[PDB]
Design a protein around this ligand. Structure first.
Ligand SMILES: *[C@@H]1O[C@H](CO)[C@@H](O)[C@H](O)[C@H]1NC(C)=O
Ligand SMILES: *[C@@H]1O[C@H](CO)[C@@H](O)[C@H](O)[C@H]1NC(C)=O
Lengths: 402, 100, 50
């Protein structure tokens, strides 16, 4: 009845673990129950990740739910490729087809390339952060030569937080040389809130500018500060709060005590934590399908030292890969399904424009259909003051005597 | 393999690394204080206990593009070898007026 | 030396003296002049433009 799994959590991801504990209770049946082993470590230090993964492998788990950084993603993906241990993650998907990885985050590359094509952009800025892989930067660069775009890629990531005022004032001085008015922000929801505040300081948020936040949590970050400036701000949202499923989850979420569940007493949940809750439903239903299929998975004995040479892989990991990769359930992230590589498939990403009345569901795409939502007859603002410019030169435009 | 040498008790490790494997060595030698001496492309950032023989080519590439007075050119790169140098010419593409 | 996944991470002392020795080496070689900074990157080096 006790199924052992390993959890690799960043030390600063309290809500991302708060959602994990909630999932354990919601899907806990009388047939069995999952037993987690939680190791809070530094996600970037791959030596800690290696020391953590091998801690769970010696304890003999059956799958591992964790995260990874750019500096550590390969460490996870290669140990799981040899030892045939299954890894479920809500971080960015692996740049390539790696087995035994259950990527809970959908591929956003298809979204950004077409959102650009909807607005008919042919010259824009791209402030990226390598903390989540250069997968998307190679996408906009590859499609830049095909469609003959004129793009400026700026590795805004490696910047120090003490000289941040003088360097951020310096970045926008470069972008002024082409009078760039179309910017894509590709940082994590943290550094975006840093760029947002420095955009308000220099005042580049009025009529004319048009930003696109490129992560799955448009409503996660704060938008009320660049809402009324007049700059159109687009984004992406994966946790559709309109679905009665999430509203069922949000109602129970809004009430939990914040001491036992940090960062959970609010009405929203970050796309990272939301994918974590939806990860438990994948694993619980994965093993339940092993039971009904009459499949025996318990380890024959000690898995031994992960550094065992030659590396002998326990055979039943393949059945766990095929079990997790054939799960199909419904959760906060809408539809959930995986291909033979573990990548998100058959999914749905919501598109959001920021207006005067707040975030507004405008569009959505799919790995088969792109930009379909037409339209939003509901909501609506019906408020548009058209800006008209003219020159003081008699007798066309003269200031009255009074 | 880094552990196969640590048990044997080597006093320094000469080796190489790839784009995927560089971070494995950099943080391993950073905690266990083993000295890594290698020619493989220099660490993107300051990682202690690593000695890079190959000089920083990127600083030299920027200077050469200036002397030739280029404005629009094609830059070919392979994701396997990396793109730490393509990053450098893309960052400096705004300040120096380049349409890469 | 034992295992590399030694918990807690026991860092041997003489490793920090080896790091200092390497970066303090200054000789001549096929790459031109060779001296290092406290991080390990080449300095005072020479790249021919051909
Ligand atoms: C694809 O998604 C649709 C919409 O939710 C679902 O009804 C269908 O079963 C899925 N098909 C496959 C093959 O997973
Ligand atoms: C710098 O390099 C030159 C060329 O080899 C060498 O002659 C000089 O001594 C070096 N500087 C120092 C301080 O060693």
């Amino acid at each position: 009845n006790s199924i052992q799994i390993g959890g690799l959590f960043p030390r600063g991801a309290d809500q991302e673990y708060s959602a994990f504990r909630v999932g354990m209770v919601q899907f806990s049946t009388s047939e069995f129950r999952l037993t987690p082993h939680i190791d809070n470590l530094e996600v970037a230090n791959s030596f800690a990740v290696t020391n953590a993964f091998c801690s769970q492998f010696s304890r003999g788990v059956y799958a591992i739910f964790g995260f990874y950084d750019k500096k550590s993603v390969n460490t996870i993906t290669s140990f799981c490729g040899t030892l045939h241990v299954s890894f479920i993650t809500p971080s960015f998907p692996t740049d390539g087809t790696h087995p035994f990885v259950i990527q809970m985050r959908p591929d956003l590359k298809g979204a950004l390339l077409s959102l650009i094509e909807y607005y008919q952009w042919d010259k824009f800025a791209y402030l990226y952060d390598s903390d989540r892989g250069l997968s998307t930067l190679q996408a906009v660069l590859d499609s830049a030569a095909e469609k003959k775009w004129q793009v400026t890629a700026i590795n805004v990531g490696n910047i120090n937080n003490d000289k941040k005022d003088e360097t951020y004032r310096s970045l926008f001085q470069d972008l002024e040389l082409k009078k760039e008015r179309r910017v894509i922000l590709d940082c994590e929801r943290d550094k975006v809130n840093d760029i947002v505040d420095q955009v308000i300081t220099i005042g580049k948020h009025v009529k004319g500018y048009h930003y696109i936040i490129a992560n799955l949590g448009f409503t996660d970050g704060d938008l009320l500060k660049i809402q009324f400036g007049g700059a159109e701000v687009s984004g992406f949202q994966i946790v559709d709060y309109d679905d009665s499923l999430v509203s069922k989850f949000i109602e129970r979420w809004s009430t939990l005590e914040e001491k036992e569940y940090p960062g959970a007493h609010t009405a929203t949940i970050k796309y990272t934590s939301a994918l974590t809750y939806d990860a438990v439903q994948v694993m619980t239903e994965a093993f339940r399908n092993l039971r009904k299929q009459r499949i025996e998975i318990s380890r024959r004995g000690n898995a031994g030292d992960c550094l065992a040479n030659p590396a002998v892989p326990w055979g039943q990991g393949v059945e766990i890969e095929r079990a997790l990769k054939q799960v199909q359930v419904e959760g906060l992230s809408g539809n959930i399904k995986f291909d033979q590589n573990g990548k998100r498939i058959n999914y749905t990403i919501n598109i959001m424009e920021l207006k005067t009345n707040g975030p507004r569901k405008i569009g959505y795409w799919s790995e088969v259909d792109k930009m379909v939502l037409t339209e939003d007859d509901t909501s609506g603002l019906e408020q548009k003051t058209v800006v008209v410019t003219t020159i003081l030169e008699s007798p066309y435009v003269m200031m009255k005597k009074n």
